[PDB]
Amino acid sequence: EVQLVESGGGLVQPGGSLRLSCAASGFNISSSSIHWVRQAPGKGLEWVASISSSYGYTSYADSVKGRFTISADTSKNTAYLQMNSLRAEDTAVYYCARSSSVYWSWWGYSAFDYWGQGTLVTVSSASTKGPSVFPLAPSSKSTSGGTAALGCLVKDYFPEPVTVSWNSGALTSGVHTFPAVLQSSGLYSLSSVVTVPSSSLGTQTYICNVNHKPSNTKVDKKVEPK
Amino acid sequence: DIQMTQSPSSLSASVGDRVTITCRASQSVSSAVAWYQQKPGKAPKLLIYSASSLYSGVPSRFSGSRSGTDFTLTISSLQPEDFATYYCQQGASEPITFGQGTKVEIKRTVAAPSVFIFPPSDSQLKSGTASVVCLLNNFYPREAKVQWKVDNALQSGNSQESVTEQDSKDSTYSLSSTLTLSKADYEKHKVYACEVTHQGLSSPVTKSFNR
Amino acid sequence: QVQLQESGGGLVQPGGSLRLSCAASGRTISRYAMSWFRQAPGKEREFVAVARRSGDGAFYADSVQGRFTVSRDDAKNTVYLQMNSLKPEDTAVYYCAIDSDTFYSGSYDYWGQGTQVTVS
Amino acid sequence: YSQTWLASVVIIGLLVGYINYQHVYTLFENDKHFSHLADFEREMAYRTEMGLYYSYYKTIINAPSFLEGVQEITHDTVTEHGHEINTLNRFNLYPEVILAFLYRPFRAFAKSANWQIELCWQVNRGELRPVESCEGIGNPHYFYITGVFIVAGTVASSIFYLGVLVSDSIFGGFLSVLCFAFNHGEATRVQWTPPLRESFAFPFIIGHIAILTFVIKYKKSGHSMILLLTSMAVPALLFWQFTQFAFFTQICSIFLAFSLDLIPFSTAKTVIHSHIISFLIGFLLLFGNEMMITALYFPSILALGMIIYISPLLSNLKFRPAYVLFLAIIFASITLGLKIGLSKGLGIEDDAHIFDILRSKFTSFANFHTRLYTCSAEFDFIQYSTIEKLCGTLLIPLALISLVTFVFNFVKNTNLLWRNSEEIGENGEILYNVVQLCCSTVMAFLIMRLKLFMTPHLCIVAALFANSKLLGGDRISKTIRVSALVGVIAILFYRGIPNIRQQLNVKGEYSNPDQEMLFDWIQHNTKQDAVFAGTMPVMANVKLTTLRPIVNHPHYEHVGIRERTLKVYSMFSKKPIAEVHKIMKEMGVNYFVFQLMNCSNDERRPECVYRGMWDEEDPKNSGRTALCDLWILAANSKDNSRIAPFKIVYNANRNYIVLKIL
Amino acid sequence: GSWAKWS
Ligand SMILES: CC(C)=CCC/C(C)=C/CC/C(C)=C\CC/C(C)=C/CC[C@H](C)CCOP(=O)(O)C[C@@H]1O[C@H](CO)[C@@H](O)[C@H](O)[C@@H]1O
C-alpha cells in the first residue's frame, strides 16, 4: 500500500524548465525524507536532491546546487522538483526514494527501501521527424550459398523508440537489433539484420517496417539483391 | 565528497558458484552502507542495509560483511534470477555517493567471432554521406577492442561502436562499428577495409573490398 | 622484447595426465595476462586457454572445457597447466602466449618453442 | 634556520615581560610616592582591603619564629573579635605566608653578613613632625611589592606567547603585546593596588591558559603535561577564591571544543586529569574549605570527566546537532544536579553574593548587601567611556575582524550537520580562545572590574589578524603580508603613544592627614585590648596599624560577617538609640569610629546612601528620627546630653568621630 | 566606597 510514483518527465530544449512530481500513496509525507536520484544512460546512479518535509529541510547535490529546487506539499502528500537552466548532460532517468527523516537521521540516513518507477527527461535541440531507412544486403558475390544476412539501417529517428518488423514479422530467427545510439551530432542510428536463407534469398520480396508511433510513421522499405 | 569504489568492475560466474563483491570507502563511514540490486529495465531494490542486515523479503542466500573500511557482499550460490548490477551506497554524510557498480554475467566457452562488412548502399548518394558497417557476432567475452587504421594512419572521432547484451538463448554478443564519410571523403582510396581484434585469434582479422 | 621457457619432460602415456609449465624470463608477468594456444597442421593459431593476472577467472575453449585447468604463481612467475585423459585428436604444439598490450587485447607476438603432443 | 626562531621568540617574550614589570613599578612609584613616605604612612596608603591582607604579612614577619607566627594567624582571635577563626583558608593568605617565609631568613642572613640592604634617613615633611623613611630591598614594604610586581610582570610574556601560538608568527605576538601596552590602564590595576589577591592569581591563570592552548595545539599528553598544568593550577587556587569560577569558564570553553571534534581523546583525558589533581591538591591544602565544594568548578569537572569517558561509546553518531545537543544536556544536567544536590541537599555553606549581584540587576530584588555591592560602581554595568577608550586604540575593531575571519574560515572548511569521529577538525586552540573571549566579555559587560579578563583576551584574539591560513593562506604572496602587517602596527603606534603619555604623567595624592591624627589618638588614649567597630574601610586600617582588635573587616564574601555588618551598620538606621546601644554592648565593642560624611543626604543617587538603605530594609521603623541627625547634632553641639548611653570621645575637625559605648 | 577602586 506504500508506493512512490514519479511523473512529469519528457522532452525539453536546453535552458528550459521542467517541473516533475513524486506522489506517495500510503505512508504520509513529512514523516520521512524523500530523495531524487539520477541515472544517466549507461552509467551508475547519482544522487540529486533530498527533502525532509517534516520541518522543511532541503539539501542539494553539489553538481546542481543552484539550478534545482525541491518543494514539499504536505496538504496532498506529494513533492515536486523544479529544474531550470538545464545543461546538455542532465538528460537521464529520475527516481524518487524514501528514507528516514533528516531530523531523526541519528547514525545516518536509512537505506532507500521504497523506490519509484522512474521518469525519463531529455534535453534535445532537434525537431521530431521521421527517419530514413536504408537497405543493407550481403554481396551476391561474397559468401554465396552458405551463411547470409540482410537487413535495414534506420537513421535520424526521434524520439528513441522505433520498432523494426521483418516481412510482417513472419521471420524471427537470427534477429539482431542493436541498441539506439546517439552521438554529439544529435543523430540516432540503428540496424536490424536477419540471416537471410539460401536458395536466392527464398525468392521473396523482403520488407522492413519502421513503426514510430510519435510520428505515426509506418513506411515499408523493399529489400533487393545486388 | 566521500567516494565508494567497487573493485570488480566486471565479474563473470556460472550457476551455483559463490561470488563476492567488494566496496571500499575513502573515509570511515561506520556502518551506514547498503547494497542494492538493479536489473536492466527496472528500478533498484534494497538487498542489504547497514552492511550486515538482510532486508525483509530478499532471499537469505545473500550476506553482507564489514571489516575495517572494507565492505563485502557474498552470494553462496548464484541463480539465473540474480543476474544484474549491484550498487554500493553510503548514507553517513550529506552527499550520498553510490558505487560504480559491478555486473555479473554467465560464464561460457569462448567463441570465435564472425565478421561481416557492408559498404554504403546506393541510396547513400542522396544523404550527402556514405556509411560502412563492420559487424561481428558470436564472440565471448565482450572484452574486444576494434581499432581502425588506414595506410598506417591514426583514425579516431569518426567510428561509432554499438554492443548488444548477452543473448537470452545462447548468451552471445553482437558488436557493430560504423564509419561515416563525406562526399569529399568518398573520393579517397576506393578500397575499403576494416580490422577487428579479439582474444579468439592471435592476430586481428582485416577484411578489405573494392567498389 | 620478451622470452619464455617451459619445464617438465619424461615419457608420457596415452590417456593419462600431464603437468605443463611456462615461465617468462627477464620480465614480470603479473601486469599482463597469459594464454595457452594450440598449433596444428592445416589450421593453427587457435585459442585454447587464458588467465588474466592471478586466477580471477580462467577461460577455456569449447573442446577443453573441464579437461584442462590453468593456475598461475607470481612468486615463481609461471603458469601451470593440468591435463588428463588426453583425446586422440589432441596432436599439436602448445604455446605459452604473452600479450605485449596492457589493455588485454590479446596482441600476441611471442610463440616460443611449445610442447608437442602426438597420439597414434 | 628554524631553531634561531625559537630563541628569538623566547628572548622577546622575556624582554617584554621585563619591560612590563618596569612599567608597573614606575607607575606605582609615580602614583603613591613610596620613595619619601613615612614608614607608618605606607600602611595608611594601603586602603580598605590592602591593609587587611598585608597586616598578616606584617604579623608573620614580626613574630619570634615563622612557625609561631603561622600558628598565631591560623588561630586569629582579633580579626573578628568574639570567636577564633582560621584566616589561612578564609582569606587565602598563602602569598603572605610564602613572602614571610622567604623574607625572615633573608633578613636574618643580611644581618649576619652585615650587608647594607636597607639604608635610610630622616624625611622633613614640614610643619608636621619629621619622620623616618627607609628604602631598599630589605625594607618589608619593598620586599612585598617587589614580589608582587615580579609575579605580575609575566602577564606580558604570557600574552606575547599566546599571540605567538594562535598566530604562528612573531607578528601575532607583537600585535598582542602592543595592544596590551596601549590598553594597559584598562587591563590591570596592579600599579595602584598591589596587595590585593588578583595581582597574585591573574598571572598564574594566564600562564595556565597559555599552557592549555599549547597542549591543545600540539596534542600533547602524558605525565609531563599533567604536571605542567597542575603547577600553574594549584597556585592560582591557593591565591584567590575567584579562580574557582575562572577555571569554570575554561571547562565551558574546552567542552565546546571537545564536542566539535577539535581535541583528541588523549589530550582531553590529560587536561581533565590535571584539573582533577589540581583541585584535589588545592582542597587538601586549604584545610578542606567547604566553600570549594558547592561551587561551579567541582561539578563542572565531574561532568566533563564523565562526558570525556563516555565519548567513545557515541563514536557511531554521524549527526552533529544531535551529538552536540545531547552533550550539552548531559553537561548541564550533571552540573546542576551536583551543585543543587549538595548546597540545598546538604546545606553545606554556599555563597549567594555572585547570584545576588545578578538578580538585583534584572529583577527588582533590592536587599541590603546587594545594595552595598551595586552602589560601588565596580560591580555595576561597564560604562560607555571604557568602550570609547578601547575602540580608540582600535583594540575592538581588530578583534571583530579577526573573529569574523575565523568564523568565516570555520564555516567554509567544516561540515556542520554531519560529523566524522576519526578525523580531527584542526585549529582547536583558536576556537577555544574565541569561546573564552565571549565568556569573558559576557562577564565583563554585566560587571565592571572583570574587564581584567576581557581585555587580555581581546589582545590575544587580535593576533588572529596575522595568521596566514586565516587570511587567504598563500593567495596574497609573502611581500604583501609583511607590508600589510607593518602598516597595521604603524597605525596602532599613532593611536597608542598618547595613552602611555597620560599614564606616565599621572601623579597621585598622599596627604591623608586626618587618619594619621585619629590613629595617633587611638594609640595614645586607649588600652591595648580595646575592641573597635565602625565603617568597613576605617576598621581595616585600624587593624593594620595600632594593632587593635576589630569586630568587622572589609572581607565580605563568607557568611558570619554579613550578619555582623548588618548589626554594626545599625548605627546609621532609625532604630531606637537604646536598642543600638544594647546591640553594641552585646557585640562587646567599645568604640565606634566613623566619618561625618557617611550621614549626609545625597538627593542625587538615592538607594546608595546609608540613610536610604535602612528605609526599605527597615520599613516598620520608617518615620522615626534618623540617628544620623542625632550624631550630627551631638558632634556640633559638643554636649552629648540627649544621647545618654553613648558619649563622643573623639571629634577632630568634624571629619572623624569616635564614640565610646559605656 | 567600601572597596578598592579602579582609579
Ligand atoms: C555560564 C557561562 C559559560 C559563563 C557565565 C559568566 C557570568 C556572566 C558569570 C558570574 C559572575 C558574576 C556575574 C558575579 C558576582 C560579582 C563578582 C564577579 C565577585 C567576585 C569577587 C572576587 C572573589 C574578589 C575580587 O573583588 P574586589 O574588587 O577586590 C571587591 C571585594 O573583594 C574581596 C576580595 O576577597 C571580596 O571578599 C568581596 O566579595 C568583593 O568582591
Query: What are the DSSP calls for B39-108, one per residue?
Result: -TTS--EEEEETTTEE-BTB-TTEEEEEETTEEEEEESS--TT--SEEEEEE-SSSS-PPP--EEEE---
Q: Do residues A111 and A194 both lie within one domain?
A: no
CA nearest B29 in A: which residue?
A: A108
Instruction: List, by residue range, all CATH 2.60.40.10 domains of chain B.
Output: 4-106, 114-210
Atom of ligand 1 nearest to the CA of D358: 13
Task: State which of A101, A123, A145 marks the end of a domain.
Answer: A123
CATH code for the domain in which residue C90 is found: 2.60.40.10
How far is residue D173's CA from residue D165's CA, in Å, rounded to a whole number?
Answer: 8
Q: Are D41 and D519 in contact (CB under 8 A)?
A: no
Q: Are D94 and D73 in contact (CB under 8 A)?
A: no
Q: Are D620 and D628 in contact (CB under 8 A)?
A: no
Nearest-CA distance A216 → chain B (Å) = 22
Mutate to test the interface with A, among D313, D316, D318, D319 (most CBs of A within 10 A): D319
Q: Could you tell me the CA-to-CA distances from D64 to C98, D117, D139 in Å, in that order?
A: 103, 22, 18
In chain B, residues with a C-beta closer than 8 Å to the C-beta of C108 are: 202-203
Nearest CA to A189 out of B146, B139, B197, B179 is that of B179
CA nearest A106 in D: which residue?
A: D319
Cβ separation B46–A113 shorter than 8 A: yes
Q: Is A110 on the interface with D (CB under 8 A)?
A: no
CATH architecture for segment(s) B4-106:
Sandwich (2.60)
DSSP 8-class letter at D509: -
Cα–chain center distance at D14: 24
What is the DSSP annotation of B117-144? EE---GGGGTTTEEEEEEEEES-SSS--
Choosing from D244, D360, D379, D557 the residue with most ligand 1 atoms within 8 A of its CB, the one to mutate for a pocket test is D557
Q: Residue A6 pairs with which residues in a beta bridge?
A: A22
How far is residue D336's CA from residue D298's CA, in Å, rounded to a whole number?
Answer: 11
In chain E, residues with a C-beta closer than 8 Å to the C-beta of D378 are: 3, 5-6
**Experimental structure resolution, Å:** 3.6
At least 3 CB pairs under 8 A between chains C and E: no
- Compute the distance from residue A87 Cα to the ligand 1 centre, in Å: 64
Atom of ligand 1 nearest to the CA of D447: 13
CATH code for the domain in which residue A194 is found: 2.60.40.10
Helix (H, G, I), strand (E, B) or coil at B174: strand
Q: Grid coordinates standing for A202?
A: 527464398
In chain B, residues with a C-beta closer than 8 Å to the C-beta of C45 are: 201-203
Handedness of CA D481, D485, D490, D492 (dihedral sign): positive
Q: A133: Cβ–Cβ under 8 A, 6 or more apart, which residues? A: A152, A153, A154, A208, A210, A219, A221
Give the number of other Cβ atoms within 10 Å of residue A51's Cβ.
25
CATH 2.60.40.10 fits B114-210, yes or no: yes
Method of determination is cryo-EM
How far is residue D641's CA from residue C1's CA, in Å, rounded to a whole number?
Answer: 132
How far is residue D46's CA from residue D42's CA, in Å, rounded to a whole number?
Answer: 6
What is the DSSP annotation of D521-537? HHHHHS-TT--EEE-HH
Nearest CA to ligand 1 atom 22: D242
Give the number of other Cβ atoms within 10 Å of residue D290's Cβ.
14
CATH number corresponding to D513-661: 3.40.50
- Compute the distance from residue C87 Cα to the ligand 1 centre, in Å: 102
Query: What domain count does chain C have?
Result: 1
Give the number of other Cβ atoms within 10 Å of residue D401's Cβ.
15
Which residue matches cell numbers 530544449? Answer: A13
How far is residue D452's CA from residue B47's CA, in Å, rounded to a whole number?
Answer: 63
What is the span of the domain harbouring residue C24? 3-117
Name the H helices within chain A: none
Binding pocket residue ranges, ligand 1, CB within 6 Å: D 49, 196-197, 241-242, 252, 353-354, 357-358, 378-379, 439, 442-443, 446-447, 449-450, 555-557; E 3-4
What is the DSSP annotation of D280-328? HHHHHHTTT-GGGTTSSSHHHHHHHHHHHHHGGGGTT--BHHHHHHHHH
Nearest-CA distance B149 → chain A (Å) = 21
Q: Do residues A114 and A188 both lie within one domain?
A: no
Q: Do residues A32 and A107 both lie within one domain?
A: yes
Q: Grid coordinates standing for B47?
A: 538487498
Written as one letter, the residue type at D277 is I
Written as one letter, the residue type at D343 is S
How far is residue C23's CA from residue C98's CA, in Å, rounded to a whole number?
Answer: 10
Written as one letter, the residue type at A101 is S
Edge-to-edge order in the sheet of strand B70-75: B4-6, B19-25, B70-75, B62-67
- Compute the distance from residue D354 Cα to the ligand 1 centre, in Å: 6
In chain C, residues with a C-beta closer than 8 Å to the C-beta of B110 are: 47, 50, 59-62
How far is residue D403's CA from residue A83's CA, in Å, rounded to a whole number?
Answer: 38
Q: Are B47 and B65 in contact (CB under 8 A)?
A: no
Nearest CA to D49 out of D206, D240, D185, D288 is that of D240
Q: Do residues A217 and A115 both lie within one domain?
A: no
Query: What domain count does chain A have?
Result: 2
How far is residue D393's CA from residue D462's CA, in Å, rounded to a whole number?
Answer: 12
β-pairing, A181-182 vs A188-194, is antiparallel
| Domain locations in chain D as residue ranges | 33-148, 154-504, 513-661
Nearest CA to D286 out of D331, D328, D230, D241 is that of D241
Which residue matches cell numbers 550520498? Answer: B96
Helix (H, G, I), strand (E, B) or coil at D71: helix
E strands present in D64-185: 119-123, 131-135
Which residue matches cell numbers 551543585? Answer: D339
Buried b or exposed e, range A175-201, using 16+ CB within 10 angstroms: ebbbebbbeeeebbbbbbbbbbeeeeb
Angle CA(B66)–CA(B72)–CA(B78) in degrees, nearest 5?
140
Helix (H, G, I), strand (E, B) or coil at D331: helix
Nearest CA to A46 out of A56, A38, A36, A54 is that of A38
Angle CA(C101)–CA(C107)–CA(C112) in degrees, nearest 5?
105
How far is residue C28's CA from residue A126's CA, in Å, rounded to a whole number?
Answer: 53
Cα–chain center distance at C78: 10
Q: Grid coordinates standing for D536?
A: 568597613
β-pairing, A150-155 vs A132-136, is antiparallel
Q: Is A55 on the interface with D (CB under 8 A)?
A: no
Q: What are phi and psi of C67, to 5 degrees?
A: -80, -35
Cβ separation B30–D318 shorter than 8 A: yes
Task: State which of A104, A123, A142 marks the end of a domain.
Answer: A123
Q: B66: Cβ–Cβ under 8 A, 6 or more apart, which residues? A: B31, B33, B51, B52, B72
Helix (H, G, I), strand (E, B) or coil at B109: coil
How far is residue B135's CA from residue B177's CA, in Å, rounded to a whole number?
Answer: 6
DSSP 8-class letter at A169: G
How far is residue D179's CA from residue D150's CA, in Å, rounded to a whole number?
Answer: 21
Cα–chain center distance at D476: 43
How far is residue D391's CA from residue D178's CA, in Å, rounded to a whole number?
Answer: 15
Query: What does the longest C-alpha to C-alpha distance in chain E come to?
Result: 14
Nearest CA to B119 out of B196, B175, B179 is that of B179
